[PDB]
Design a protein around this ligand. Structure first.
Ligand SMILES: OC[C@H]1O[C@@H](O)[C@H](O)[C@@H](O)[C@H]1O
Ligand SMILES: [Mg+2]
Ligand SMILES: [Mn+2]
Ligand SMILES: [Mn+2]
Ligand code: NA
Ligand code: NA
Ligand code: NA
Ligand code: NA
Ligand code: NA
Lengths: 1024, 129
């Protein structure tokens, strides 16, 4: 295969002349940025690209420029192609290890200036923080080297090639290679120098190459610790090293984007509060171990750091080089079958985070990562998984400072090998306890392939060695969905060898033969529970714990039943929590023609929008946050279920349990929301609780002072006493008023003072109801009681299929008889409608009786629905009425859950209260679907301009409602595609189907399903 | 402009002014292929591109003429089936067009409908959404 270059088709050719991986430290004095505009040209394949050994700057100078760092599929006007989205399927043919012959090749060029003194003073390197997929590097027309590993860094020695004056850097970047087969993450395919490029200037005669910092407790009681510092100095011209450790800054330190990103040093005096000093002696080991007296523990809940300064010192006694960084005193163990930090068995309140920006892709500005992490902290998150590759090296200090438990993951996914198998064998479902047998059959291609060992080991070596000094990283992970094979065992051995201090995770290794932890993704409770029992012996001992590296798939409206997962987490010591998939939708901003409008709008792209040959559609839109990285109702719900303090109110008592792992409740102010006055709550340790007698209904736990990135008054946790359904004291007018009743051929009319009621007997439709200046009417297409909702992402794979199959969207109301009689106990009239509600083509339906009892100021609607006929659907999306609101309609107000939407299995974060539609920002889904329902509604007030209100309530049971002007949601691909009526409607529902997580995970749990059954419910429409 | 069908200087008044959509119109096929499908007195023209909005075209101070087709070889085509078609469409954007008359048997195109030889001056905007 000579038409494809050797290095692009050789798995062992992982790099050429790349320097060994070392711990990352940014230093302003050493790092010179080479970011900015670079000459750039794109070629069809490598053979069209120029021989870089002959490329002048005069020649390259004439090319267009691209700005580094950025992806070349994300340029003005899509100049260099468009993004491609695949989940599992490779976007290329499989012929391991060959890439396609047609292989987009981008050549980058720029120059930099070098001094006469610079070459004398410094060893010069080039450092690339990430380039997709691989590249060869040239300086001054001379080949320096080659590199693979898209999310790993690389350094190259440049000293031999460098000249005084103008220097030329040329980088040839290739889109596909043998490496593509191990980089098949469920994400956008994007290419180019998408991370920083730097020129490093290290002191020449001697300099600090590598540093290694470990904190190990000497003791069973986790007090005194040994701080070990091992320095690798390169060169002879130095005397010794100095180490200064400073007094700690408590984890409650205040931070903001500005201070977290501040990169200044040199003349800035690092710290003063000296705690410990140490010096090496001439000609001795540049390493040491020191005993530290009862240091402040580092924890994700309290990320206390000890700053340090390491100085390399010359013979004359001057400072050749300094490293300014931090130590986090913490130790991770597998202890009594649990992941343990500082003796304590922790709980992951986690999330999976990809590198994503709606405009820049994987070229995420640090500013934006800080935005992500602050938001996470604001929503009770304590852990992050680097799905599925290392991030920009500068991110890990953010983890250290803000406090996250971090799983740093190798850049290695092999998923695509499964796709032909999945299709050939018509595979429908995978399950966490059983699915590894499906991966076993294809492991031989890559993960069990000896040709790939060097590559797999490189991904491991590179992962660990760059990030080894970050206390926030407690687990190394061997990658994602790469089957299981010999190469994984090799990775495991190497990692334990390089870094004995941390644990190793790998989900593809079901039985953890070469992992320290068990890991499931999207398991049912039954499946979690079987696993527990098969791995808990007779004593009650287990050898390894279970985490859910991915669960509660957050695609669209959802996820449902986070509650039931959490109950399981707290109940068993064997479960140590999990990480939600995913942090944010991967939408890319683009211009969509609207289906509603015929015009051009800003929208967020997923698969299909960039017109890919093969793509996986909406599956990129599966975050707790939207494409713009803002909270969805998913994140709002998650914050509640994972709240680190439980507040329960019953029987004249507030019981408060501390559910943190390490910190007390002392930093929190507990407010009795019924009085506004604070409740004196004793300091509670992890797992401690107190019962306080009180008349309260609603208690909030709030931050006393600014701490970390959170502000004073920020809500950590809350609780409410359960609210009984009180019948509003509306007064029905039962006075004897004469009423004009007309039972016509087709229409029945009831007129009285301030009242006009017209019903179409043929359809069961309220033509008009006008009481005291307020008008409503039936929103009617086929039936007065409807059952359909725009399918959620979770509805799509099964429930939607069923509902469509059973024609639930085509339900018809066939009227049999209408009975009209004069009022009796204060009522003006009674209109009774007898009908069958049934969809075309089917037998099944409801023998229905709708009884309208009409008063001067109120209409009582009693609905009886009796399910009949063979071949019934299992469940319905919803059941209820749809009414047009009159032109006067202006706003609404309700007693129930709010301020946002709520659903049977996604509602507890929306506390009870009186809510006003005006105070609420309605959430717009990136992919239009079922939204804006309010469950457990006690009563609903609809305000009409200068005509008062219409109060609505359901007898004996709270109800569901939506008020919107939207339609065409089913067909709408993007927010801008959503159609809008000229007036509002009320969707008034007795019941609604749960939401679940079935797009990827368990179906709506049984107790949240709206099962097929008889329906009986009474509504009052009370007019002011 | 004028529609739904074709219009020419001396054959246009049956085509009333309105907003017309190409999709709503059955294009007329002549039995003997010849000049067809011109729209006279066009105020503005919108050309829709798949997923990229519209191109709006208008002439300053005066309405214009346009045809949009994929056809060619009309001169030599003896019958409808003899008409050749390109793999893409074209816009014929005209400042002016000769009248039609009845000279095969009868009077020539009347003087005020003839496109007489003279200087031409016209400005077009090609406005992209
Ligand atoms: O959204 C679907 C997800 O499914 C998981 O199995 C996988 O590990 C993720 O990376 C993603 O593909
Ligand atoms: Mg995958
Ligand atoms: Mn769209
Ligand atoms: Mn012919
Ligand atoms: Na992929
Ligand atoms: Na637990
Ligand atoms: Na996904
Ligand atoms: Na939709
Ligand atoms: Na002809």
């Amino acid at each position: 295969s000579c038409l494809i270059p050797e290095n692009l088709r050789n798995p062992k050719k992982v790099h050429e002349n790349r320097l060994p991986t070392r711990a990352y430290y940014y230093d302003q004095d050493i790092f010179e940025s080479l970011n900015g505009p670079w000459a750039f040209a794109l070629f069809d394949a490598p053979l069209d690209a120029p021989d870089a050994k002959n490329l002048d700057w005069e020649t390259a100078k004439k090319w267009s420029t691209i700005s580094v760092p950025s992806h070349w599929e994300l340029q003005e006007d899509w100049k260099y192609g468009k993004p491609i989205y695949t989940n599992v399927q490779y976007p290329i043919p499989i012929d391991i290890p060959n890439p396609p012959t047609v292989n987009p090749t981008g050549v980058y060029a720029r120059t930099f200036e070098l001094d006469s003194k610079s070459i004398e003073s410094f060893e010069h390197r080039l450092r690339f923080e990430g380039v997709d997929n691989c590249y060869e590097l040239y300086v001054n027309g001379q080949y320096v080297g080659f590199n693979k590993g898209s999310r790993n860094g690389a350094e190259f020695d440049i000293q031999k090639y460098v000249s005084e004056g103008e220097n030329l850097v040329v980088v040839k970047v290739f889109k596909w290679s043998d490496s593509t087969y191990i980089e098949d993450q469920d994400q956008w395919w994007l290419s180019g120098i998408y991370r920083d490029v730097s020129l490093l200037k290290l002191p020449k005669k001697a300099h600090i190459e590598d540093v290694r910092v470990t904190t190990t407790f000497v003791d069973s009681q986790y007090q005194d610790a040994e701080l070990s510092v091992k320095v690798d100095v390169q060169g002879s011209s130095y005397d010794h090293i100095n180490f200064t450790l400073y007094e700690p800054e408590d984890g409650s330190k205040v931070y903001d984007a500005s201070s977290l990103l501040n990169e200044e040093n040199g003349n800035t005096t690092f710290s003063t509060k000296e705690f410990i000093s140490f010096s090496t002696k001439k000609n001795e080991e540049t390493a040491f171990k020191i005993n530290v007296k009862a240091p402040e523990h580092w924890t994700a809940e309290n990320p206390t750091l000890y700053k340090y300064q390491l100085d390399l010192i010359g013979s004359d006694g001057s400072v050749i080089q300094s490293i300014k960084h931090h130590v986090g005193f913490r130790q991770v163990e597998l202890k009594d079958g649990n992941i343990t930090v500082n003796g304590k068995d922790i709980l992951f309140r986690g999330v999976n985070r990809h590198d994503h920006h709606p405009r820049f892709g994987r070229a995420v500005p640090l500013d934006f990562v800080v935005r992500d992490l602050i938001l996470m902290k604001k929503f009770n998150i304590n852990a992050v998984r680097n799905s599925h590759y290392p991030n920009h090296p500068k991110v890990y200090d953010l983890f250290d400072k803000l406090g996250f438990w971090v799983i740093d993951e190798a850049d290695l996914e092999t998923h695509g090998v499964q796709e032909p198998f999945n299709r050939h064998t018509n595979l429908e479902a995978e399950y966490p306890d059983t699915k590894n047998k499906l991966y076993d059959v294809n492991a031989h291609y890559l993960s069990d392939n000896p040709e790939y060992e060097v590559a797999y080991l490189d991904r491991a070596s590179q992962l660990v060695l760059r990030d080894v000094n970050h206390p926030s990283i407690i687990i190394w992970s061997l990658g994602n969905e790469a089957c299981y094979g010999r190469n994984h065992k090799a990775m495991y051995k190497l990692i334990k060898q390089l870094d004995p201090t941390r644990l190793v995770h790998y989900e593809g290794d079901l039985n953890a033969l070469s992992a320290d932890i068990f890991s499931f993704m999207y398991p049912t409770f039954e499946i979690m529970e079987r696993w527990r029992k098969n791995h808990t012996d007779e004593n009650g001992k287990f050898e390894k714990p279970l985490i859910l590296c991915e669960y509660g798939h957050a695609m669209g409206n959802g996820p449902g039943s986070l509650k039931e997962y959490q109950e399981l987490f707290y109940k068993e010591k064997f479960y140590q929590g999990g990480f939600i998939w995913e942090w944010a939708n991967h939408g890319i901003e683009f211009e969509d023609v609207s289906t509603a409008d015929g015009k051009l709008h800003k929208a967020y792209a997923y698969g299909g929008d960039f017109k890919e040959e093969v793509h996986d559609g909406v599956f990129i839109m599966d975050g707790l946050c939207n494409s713009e990285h803002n909270p969805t109702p998913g994140l709002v719900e998650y914050k509640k279920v994972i709240e680190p303090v439980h507040i329960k109110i019953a029987h004249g008592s507030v019981t408060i349990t501390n559910k943190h792992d390490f910190i007390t409740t002392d930093h929190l102010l507990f407010i009795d929301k019924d009085t506004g006055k604070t409740i004196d709550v004793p300091s509670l340790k992890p797992e401690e609780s107190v019962t306080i007698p009180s008349d309260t209904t609603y208690v909030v736990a709030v931050l006393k002072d600014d701490a970390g990135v959170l502000k004073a008054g920020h809500e950590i946790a809350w609780g409410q006493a359960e609210l009984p359904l009180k019948v509003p004291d509306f007064v029905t007018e039962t006075a004897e008023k004469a009423a004009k009743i007309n039972d016509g051929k087709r229409y029945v009319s009831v007129e009285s003072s301030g009242l006009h009621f017209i019903l179409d007997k043929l359809l069961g439709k309220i033509e008009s109801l006008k009481v005291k200046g307020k008008e409503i009417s039936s929103k009617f297409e086929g039936s007065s009681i409807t059952f359909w909702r725009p399918p959620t992402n979770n509805d799509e794979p099964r429930d939607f299929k069923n509902w469509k199959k059973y024609n639930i969207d085509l339900m018809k109301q066939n009227i049999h008889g209408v009975s009209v009689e004069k009022g009796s106990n204060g009522s003006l009239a009674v209109v009774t409608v007898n009908s069958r509600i049934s969809p075309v083509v089917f037998y099944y339906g409801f023998e229905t009786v709708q009884k309208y009892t009409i008063f001067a100021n109120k209409i009582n609607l009693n609905t009886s629905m009796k399910l009949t006929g063979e071949y019934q659907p299992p469940d319905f999306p919803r059941v209820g009425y749809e009414f047009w609101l009159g032109d006067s309609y202006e706003s609404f107000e309700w007693l129930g859950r709010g301020p946002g939407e709520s659903y049977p299995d996604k509602k507890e974060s929306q506390r009870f209260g009186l809510y006003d539609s005006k105070d609420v920002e309605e959430f717009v889904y990136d992919y239009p679907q079922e939204n804006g329902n309010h469950t457990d509604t006690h009563f609903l007030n609809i305000k009409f301009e200068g005509a008062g209100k219409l109060s609505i309530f359901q007898k004996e049971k709270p109800f569901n409602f939506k008020i919107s002007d939207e339609y065409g949601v089913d067909e709408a691909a993007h927010a801008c595609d959503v159609k809008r009526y000229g007036r509002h409607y009320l969707r008034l529902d007795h019941a609604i189907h749960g939401v679940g997580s079935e797009a990827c995970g368990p179906a709506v749990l049984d107790q949240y399903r709206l099962k097929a059954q008889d329906f009986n419910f009474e509504f009052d429409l009370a007019f002011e």
